[PDB]
UniProtKB/Swiss-Prot annotation, chains A, C:
GO cellular component, one term: serine palmitoyltransferase complex
Modified residue annotations for N6-(pyridoxal phosphate)lysine: 327
Gene3D superfamilies named in the record: Aspartate Aminotransferase, domain 1 (3.90.1150.10), Type I PLP-dependent aspartate aminotransferase-like (Major domain) (3.40.640.10)
Known function: Component of the serine palmitoyltransferase multisubunit enzyme (SPT) that catalyzes the initial and rate-limiting step in sphingolipid biosynthesis by condensing L-serine and activated acyl-CoA (most commonly palmitoyl-CoA) to form long-chain bases. The SPT complex is composed of SPTLC1, SPTLC2 or SPTLC3 and SPTSSA or SPTSSB. Within this complex, the heterodimer consisting of SPTLC1 and SPTLC2/SPTLC3 forms the catalytic core. The composition of the serine palmitoyltransferase (SPT) complex determines the substrate preference.
Species of provenance: Homo sapiens (Human)
Pathway this chain belongs to: Lipid metabolism; sphingolipid metabolism
Stated name of the protein: Serine palmitoyltransferase 2
Curated annotation (Swiss-Prot), chains B, D:
The protein's name: Serine palmitoyltransferase 1
Protein species of origin: Homo sapiens
Catalytic activity: L-serine + hexadecanoyl-CoA + H(+) = 3-oxosphinganine + CO2 + CoA; octadecanoyl-CoA + L-serine + H(+) = 3-oxoeicosasphinganine + CO2 + CoA; tetradecanoyl-CoA + L-serine + H(+) = 3-oxohexadecasphinganine + CO2 + CoA; dodecanoyl-CoA + L-serine + H(+) = 3-oxotetradecasphinganine + CO2 + CoA
GO biological process: ceramide biosynthetic process; positive regulation of lipophagy; regulation of fat cell apoptotic process; sphinganine biosynthetic process; sphingolipid biosynthetic process; sphingolipid metabolic process; sphingomyelin biosynthetic process; sphingosine biosynthetic process
Residue spans crossing the bilayer: 7-27
Pathology noted in the entry: Amyotrophic lateral sclerosis 27, juvenile: A form of amyotrophic lateral sclerosis, a neurodegenerative disorder affecting upper motor neurons in the brain and lower motor neurons in the brain stem and spinal cord, resulting in fatal paralysis. Sensory abnormalities are absent. The pathologic hallmarks of the disease include pallor of the corticospinal tract due to loss of motor neurons, presence of ubiquitin-positive inclusions within surviving motor neurons, and deposition of pathologic aggregates.
Lineage: Eukaryota, Metazoa, Chordata, Craniata, Vertebrata
Organ and tissue specificity: Widely expressed. Not detected in small intestine.
Stretch list, region Interaction with SPTLC2: 1-57
């Protein structure tokens, strides 16, 4: 495969001193955690956690205490960063209900006052459709008045409505594939439609950084799972060759199927998948492709049709196209697109259709209205404006952040920008300092990531203006000066 | 002997070290029975290419017979409610799991529109960050207060609730005693957790006792392992596949006698059973604390998307960090949360709707008795029960065809019925095909006996 | 498979003292051989062997000297036992041209006098057809006068005659199979018809004691050869199971064919093959059977139809039936019998037919006459008389030899009787002493056999009377008393 | 350095032994890159049974097209000789390899009958024991004396002679330079011996020189290996597949220059070439000692079954113990040995038959020139030559069909011809299809020109 335009990604390596220092910090935390646990065990220090009721003392202990080691010792110290309640629409500016704790984050008590105007860089807005006023809200209100809050049965029995059918045909037209099917949860889409496609005696080649839903769907099916390196086409060639040549592990038999699970944009890294190469190998080795366009269905592409439009390839090359409405379109749900026989088989033999409740009518109405707005069916130019504004914002933000001396991951086109903090204490420090300057960011630590790579993710949007980006960039530069977060040798 | 030991002691050090090394060499040689052949071979490039060429993958989807009963989806031309329109024919809804008629209350729609004006439609993020609204905490508090319990946790999808709750506590190397007629969500939850699964007979305490005593024998076999294995009993308050209630007090006694915690599912039971509608526990009077975890979904009674789990903080708090459907997915939209809150307010205001529902269920269950080809499996307190073929035919497909003919002839006479749908190749214990009857607090008396008469006449017409 | 009558074989194990003593003898021989070679190398002792011509001294040496070690040191000492010329028909009594050597068996000079009346127990007569006078000789003389000594071309071009066709149809009627083909050499039959049946990608399961012709035929074909233990059905099951389950060695592919090479009677051991069991496994595992009835085609069976008649099974169960006319019928040649398609394919794609000269006319006439005599077509009772006389002789001889205290190998029915000598010097001693008493036997030593088992083989015949057997038995008993050859603890 | 060495020397013994053991452990660990996964798996009994069931063997013999040219065997109704009867039609034999007419001499039949009266038909044993007759030694002595050589050895089957002689001397790791147009017996002999085979162009000394010089370069590359490899050159005196003679003197010079022994095949050459009929050596005058081994078969000239090898005792004596066809097979019947002895006596008595054979071969080879579609490949001294298609068609099958039509039309006119037969899938260098012409000392002049005219007319009739 070849690229019609350059494909440039930068993953700068960690400085050695920073690695030594983060190991020092983790060792200190581990030793103090062991001392903490000893003190709590010998009842010298009071334990604030709940306890099993006295009637079940002789029962086997519910949890293994070593499993929650990091929860009590490392997670609880900076627990105030994550579960931050909000009390307004998650636009470019969000209102956060401010909270305080006096028992060192074990229990939080809410103060009356409320923060206002916090710049939102943690919500998944990509086209700015999360608005409490507009045309989509009016249509959703109309359908809510007509239809109600939710359906009370499954698709197969009585829960199929006309709204679902028209949403499915609209999605099929939008993607470009023959047919599509819709579900009420993006997680459930994978977890219930991967077991149906593959079973015992098949092979699944998962990326190194796949989402939890894809992994759970792979495990629920009896297929064998092999993990190849992140965006390493050579590794994918090697696993495909070995799987085809050597067959099944115990008794040498041909694989019934070979399925490759990949995503458009990986949220944490921000790296766009090398789609032309993987499609080339898929065709060469006669494999099947499952593409998760959860993050790229609205963010990427000149018109917002996904990575298949960003690269310019043919949607018929991708066998299964999963997708999620939560990120870009501003409403919950999910979908799978493909050929008509695939959609019929999924309509008949999918867990979600048989046993699970359908989508809500206002939600499908909001999805329909937003999708019509993107494709220009309303007749206005609002569809193209947001798509070009998002690209302008992401290019400006990434360029200015990289020229300041920070370390940034991923491709230059991906709207998600991971800055690297590299140290356990700088996670909480960055979170608290950024909140003190009225900016909301998301910090990811050790057990999720590798040990040396701890990050903070900025999710950009088309709702952000130039003034908001300038304010955020100035605050980021000031904080990076304060915490010495500029680790880049190149600039 | 002793002289040899003395002579060895008098000998130098390095020589004895060498002799010991030789002894170790001998003991390694004696047990080295791995008769390695010392050969290495590899394939050629052309052979690899021909192996690539000969392999042929199966199609992604098998061809469909195109005669599937589930191939044709019913198309509702409007909201699914009382006096619905399905397939272009006016009907009366006897298939939608709307027990309390809260779907079309103007109060619920008013609350939903009020929260829509403020927040919008999408949460745009997980609960772990910038996806928690005040409505979510308010709804969790309301659910905790309603059921007289410390804590509750809400999921944005009803199926994922129990399927994420079960794997959080049960891990590899544990023992689970689950009923045979358990819904598919429980089955997939028990598949996700790699624990050992033991099934007992439906609503039989004898099989549970036998399995528990065999587990006791196995515990006596190896106490050390028995001290690190946890035992769970997963049951449903009102079974969907059968429509029968569960014997809670005996389960509680077995729990306290054999040291095995209890997981309870109240999806049908939650809003219909009890004086105030709190489940099978209120129906039996069992104390709430005797049950570790109670799972439910707001889809049936509350008429809103999502589910929840209820229990003590010691048990609930683990799901916020181990529940995959909670950690790795977007939260419930504020619209549905407000609708659920208003439904809870309405349920708390008037507790007589449960009584009238019990009345109507009893009436219709008594009336539907006396059909030659149809037997009414279920109980006189469940809103949803079944109608099965008394003398079943030789095959399942002919049975489902007969039941679908009955269903179609009923729809042509303004009675909207449905047939229970299952995954034939996935269900652990596949139930027999059966028509499903659902009772609401909205169906008047005359509609009840009219539906009974219509089903009776159609059954006699078809099955004779 | 089951036996209609008992199948009793006795392989008595060597006494330990005899093993120690034969190892002592072989060690002494090896040391003296090394000294012999040293003396010959340093020119201290004159070498009687020929030498390369002076013009080729700088050429690389033709032979490797270590390969002929046993020839000069062990074989040459008792070389006078084997290549004994004869000057009469090899009947029950043969005339041997007696020879003497003064250079210790390196060179033999013939004395004028000729031994007469030596009892022949080394020739392969089994039915006594090796007679210089009779009906077969008259028919052979007639055909010699008519046709000549030999044909001057191959079967395919002009060398096919009517005599060959009628011999082939007679052989097909005799065996009971549909068709048969004839060749001018028993060795060539295997060596030229095993490469045609199997090729690269096939498996051959050879017995542990197969003839050299079968091994050479297997090697000339590219098939993989696996050797199973002698008459060990458990080993045959294990190799068949492993071959079917695990496939080809490098790349796991199914075997194109599985061919099992076995013989009726093994000449050295005297053990009859366990035909019912091997046919049972052949049918169970869908293999192919090649049966070499070189020794059993005339010796075994109530009517002399081979092991398939001795056991009583069906000839159609055996896929390929090789055979040789040299042993029983008294004339050189060979044949293969089977179904018509097999014979046609061999007629078209066999090396012997295409490139090699056909049989001689007098030889095929003698085979035809003897085969007609066996089946009773001549109308006399001579056919059954020889067959029953051979069984009487072999039973009497084996019983009387076993009651004397010797160690005998093989089944009680096999006409070949191997007596065990067990020591290197007793080989030559037995040969010379038996010749001094006018008995001709065949002695087999180390490099052919296992190290501890050296033997002397008696080949019985229907020409031997009761008087001849009594004389031979008395001489054998006397020699066994002289050399202490009775090693049997049982009797 | 030096101080460290002194300190180590001053330290005790057992401690240093332990430190050395640790050093050996480290050096073992560093090179132990075998990343073993520590896993063991085995197949189940039912899986073994299903693997047994799925395997299907190919048929023992592939189906035949039933249109094979070799499917129909010619049937001779009597002895193959001059004025034979083939396929029921009277003919004149131009196909049997009987060059000297010794098949039907009354003297040969008298000798054969005399030895039949004494010994019978079968030897009944190998030469290794009780299978050696006085006639065998007499025949070996006669063959040794006839060819002016020390020793000769006789095999009971012509094909097996060279096929057993070649593997006895050439072993694995040697080099053999064999002509491309070598008969099948030589090819199978070279296959039985696992030595390395190098083929050069037919009757080209340039390719032999090039291969020898490349071998010389390889010798200079590694002298130690070059000192233990033996080099052989296998050639035929009169090639069967072509009918051309071999350049002996140049081969002898190449042998003495490059240190490679010579194996010679004289099957056609043995009884036709030379003043006294001793082969190509007598034709060229080359000394007999320059050639290590000379193989022949008594089937063509002597009209008797069997073959022989001739040479010095140093070379011949090895075959008595290493020749498989000699060691593991019954000897030649005394009948054929006596026939061969009488044929040798007749050949020694009158040496003019070779001259008249040369005369007739020259005449017929000259006469057969001038056929439009047939070219006469061969030489004017070989009794057997070929006729090939000048302008060959697109396929071999059409060519053999045309040649067989010519052969049939010739047989219908009392001329008995034959077509050369080969194994298509086995021959290393498959020759083109060709009719074969064989000349005898029995065919009169008029029969020669009549056969020439008949073949000419049939060729013009068919190929135009
Ligand atoms: C089994 C695993 C035990 C790990 C022991 C780790 C010892 C190091 C340690 O944590 O020291 C701690 C106490 O150390 C204790 O009090 C040990 C308490 C173990 C519970 C003291 O660590 P510090 O000096 O506070 O740093
Ligand atoms: C290399 C292999 C060499 C083997 C040497 C075997 C030594 C034993 C041996 O044969 O001794 C012999 C001579 O020994 C010699 O004369 C050695 C001559 C080697 C040639 C002497 O053996 P002995 O005492 O006659 O018994």
């Amino acid at each position: 495969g070849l690229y019609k335009r350059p494909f440039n990604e930068a993953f700068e390596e960690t400085p050695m001193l920073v690695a030594v220092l983060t190991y020092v910090g983790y060792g200190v935390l581990t030793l103090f955690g062991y001392l903490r646990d000893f003190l709590r065990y010998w009842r010298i220090e009071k334990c604030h956690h709940a306890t099993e009721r006295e009637e079940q003392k002789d029962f086997v202990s519910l949890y293994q205490d070593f499993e929650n080691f990091y929860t009590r010792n490392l997670y609880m110290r900076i627990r105030d960063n994550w579960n931050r309640p909000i009390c307004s629409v998650p636009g470019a500016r969000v209102d956060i209900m401010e909270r305080q704790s006096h028992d060192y984050n074990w229990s939080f008590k809410y103060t009356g006052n409320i923060i206002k105007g916090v710049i939102n860089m943690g919500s998944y807005n990509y086209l700015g459709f999360a608005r409490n006023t507009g045309s989509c809200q009016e249509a959703a209100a109309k359908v809510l008045e007509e239809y109600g809050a939710g359906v009370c049965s499954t698709r197969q029995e009585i829960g199929n409505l006309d709204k679902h059918e028209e949403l499915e045909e609209l999605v099929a037209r939008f993607l470009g594939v023959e047919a599509a099917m819709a579900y009420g949860m993006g997680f459930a889409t994978n977890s219930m439609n991967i077991p149906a496609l593959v079973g015992k005696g098949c092979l699944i080649l998962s990326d190194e950084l796949n989402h939890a839903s894809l992994v759970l769907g792979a495990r629920l099916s009896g297929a064998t799972i092999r993990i190849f390196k992140h965006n390493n086409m050579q590794s994918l060639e090697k696993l495909l060759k070995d799987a085809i040549v050597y067959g099944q592990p115990r008794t040498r038999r041909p694989w019934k199927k070979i399925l490759i699970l990949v995503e458009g944009i990986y949220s944490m890294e921000g790296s766009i998948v090398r789609l032309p190469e993987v499609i080339a190998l898929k065709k060469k080795y006669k494999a099947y492709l499952y593409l998760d366009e959860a993050h790229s269905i609205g963010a990427l592409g000149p018109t917002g049709r996904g990575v298949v439009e960003y690269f310019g390839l043919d949607p018929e090359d991708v066998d299964v196209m999963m997708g999620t409405f939560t990120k870009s379109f501003g409403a919950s749900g999910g979908y799978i697109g493909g050929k008509k026989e695939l959609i019929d088989y999924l309509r008949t033999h999918s867990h979600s259709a048989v046993y699970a409740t359908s989508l809500s009518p206002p939600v499908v109405e909001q999805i329909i209205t937003s999708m019509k707005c993107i494709m220009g069916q309303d007749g206005t130019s609002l569809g193209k404006e947001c798509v070009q504004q998002l690209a302008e914002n992401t290019r400006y933000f990434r360029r200015r952040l990289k020229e300041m001396g920070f370390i940034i991951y991923g491709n230059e086109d991906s709207p998600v920008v991971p800055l690297m903090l590299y140290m356990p204490a700088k996670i909480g420090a960055f979170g608290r300092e950024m909140l003190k300057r009225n900016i909301g960011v998301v910090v990811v630590g050790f057990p999720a990531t590798p040990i040396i790579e701890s990050r903070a993710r900025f999710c950009l949007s088309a709702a952000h203006t130039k003034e908001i980006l300038d304010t955020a960039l100035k605050e980021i530069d000031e904080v990076g000066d304060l915490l010495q977060l500029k680790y880049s040798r190149h600039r | 002997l002793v002289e040899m030991v003395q002579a060895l002691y008098e000998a130098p050090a390095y020589h004895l070290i060498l002799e010991g090394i030789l002894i170790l060499w001998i003991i390694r040689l004696l047990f080295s029975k791995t008769y390695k052949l010392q050969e290495r071979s590899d394939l050629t490039v052309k052979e690899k290419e021909e192996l690539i060429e000969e392999w042929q993958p199966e199609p992604l989807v098998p061809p469909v017979p195109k005669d599937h009963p589930a191939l044709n989806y019913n198309i509702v031309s409007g909201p699914p409610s009382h006096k619905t329109v399905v397939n272009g024919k006016e009907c009366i809804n006897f298939a939608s799991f709307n027990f309390l008629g809260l779907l079309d209350n103007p109060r619920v729609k008013a609350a939903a529109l009020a929260s829509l004006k403020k927040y919008g439609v999408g949460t745009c993020g997980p609960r772990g960050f910038y996806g928690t609204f005040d409505v979510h905490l308010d709804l969790e508090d309301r659910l905790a207060k309603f059921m007289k319990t410390e804590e509750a946790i809400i999921y944005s999808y009803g199926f994922a609730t129990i399927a994420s709750a079960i794997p959080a506590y049960s891990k590899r190397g544990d023992i689970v005693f689950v009923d045979r007629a358990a819904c598919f969500a429980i089955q997939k939850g028990l598949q996700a957790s790699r624990s050992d699964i033991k099934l007992f007979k439906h609503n039989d305490m004898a099989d549970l006792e036998r399995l528990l005593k065999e587990q006791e024998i196995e515990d006596q076999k190896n106490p050390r392992k028995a001290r690190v294995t946890r035992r769970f009993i997963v049951v449903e308050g009102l079974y969907m596949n059968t429509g029968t209630i569960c014997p809670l007090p005996e389960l509680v006694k077995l729990k306290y006698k054999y040291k095995a915690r209890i997981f309870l599912e109240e999806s049908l039971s939650f809003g219909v059973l009890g004086e105030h509608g709190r489940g099978v526990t209120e129906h039996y009077g069992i104390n709430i604390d005797d049950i570790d975890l109670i799972s439910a979904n707001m889809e049936n009674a509350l008429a809103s998307i999502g589910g929840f789990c209820c229990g003590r903080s010691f048990v609930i708090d683990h799901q916020r960090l181990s529940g995959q459907g909670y950690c790795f997915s977007a939260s419930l939209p504020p619209l549905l949360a407000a609708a659920a809150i208003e439904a809870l307010n309405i349920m708390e205001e008037n507790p007589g709707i449960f009584a009238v529902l019990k009345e109507k269920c009893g009436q219709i269950h008594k009336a539907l008795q006396g059909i030659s080809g149809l037997k009414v499996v279920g109980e006189s307190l469940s809103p949803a029960f079944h109608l099965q073929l008394e003398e079943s035919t030789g095959s399942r497909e002919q049975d489902v065809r007969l039941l679908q003919e009955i269903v179609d002839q009923c729809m042509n006479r303004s009675i909207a019925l449905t047939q229970a749908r299952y995954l034939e190749k996935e269900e652990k214990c596949l139930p027999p095909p059966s028509i499903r009857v659902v009772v609401t607090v909205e169906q008047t008396e005359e509609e009840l006996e009219r539906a009974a008469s219509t089903i009776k006449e159609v059954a006699q017409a078809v099955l004779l």
